[PDB]
């Protein structure tokens, strides 16, 4: 059991500060509110939250989902708080391991020159814009697509 009632057990996921530290800074009333929160999943991506974040009683296992080229925060709209509350607020999302596929070999394309030639990052920048997010960058080395959102 965690002092703030925070639940995170999914393999590969982690938080910054860690779940251990989040407990320490929890008040005797079982509340946890930290500044600059990050939750990610090794090899898939991470979500950075600047400012104050109230983690009290949050079941991260059911709320945060970080998959290949996709992040979902609150699977069901019927159970998502209003903008500004919980994790339904502005954040910076990093999606790792994202690369295009060669039409012939069906193998991923990591070649920097090839990625430049097909303007893959511009393709990702356009997708971020169409969804209302603010593209920040694409790092070829790790296939890291970064962009900001107002909320989820």
Curated annotation (Swiss-Prot):
Documented effect of changing residue 80 to A: No effect on autoprocessing. Severe loss of autoprocessing
Residues bearing the modification Phosphoserine: 111
Every Peptidase S59 domain range: 10-152
Identification of the protein by name: Nuclear pore complex protein Nup98
Organism, scientific name: Homo sapiens (Human)
Gene coding for it: NUP98
Span within the parent record: 729 to 880 of 1817
């Amino acid at each position: 059991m965690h002092p703030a009632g925070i639940i995170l057990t999914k393999v590969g996921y982690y938080t910054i500060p860690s779940m251990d530290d989040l407990a320490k800074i929890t008040n005797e009333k079982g509340e946890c509110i930290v500044s600059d929160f990050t939750i990610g999943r090794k090899g898939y991506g991470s979500i950075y939250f600047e400012g104050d974040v109230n983690l009290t009683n949050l079941n991260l296992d059911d709320i945060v989902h970080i998959r290949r080229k996709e992040v979902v925060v609150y699977l069901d709209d019927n159970q998502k708080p209003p903008v500004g509350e919980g994790l339904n607020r502005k954040a910076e999302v990093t999606l790792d391991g994202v690369w295009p596929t060669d039409k012939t070999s069906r193998c991923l394309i990591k070649s920097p020159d090839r990625l430049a030639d097909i303007n893959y990052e511009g393709r990702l920048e356009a997708v971020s814009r169409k969804q209302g997010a603010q593209f920040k960058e694409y790092r070829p080395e790790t296939g890291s697509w970064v962009f900001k959102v107002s909320h989820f």
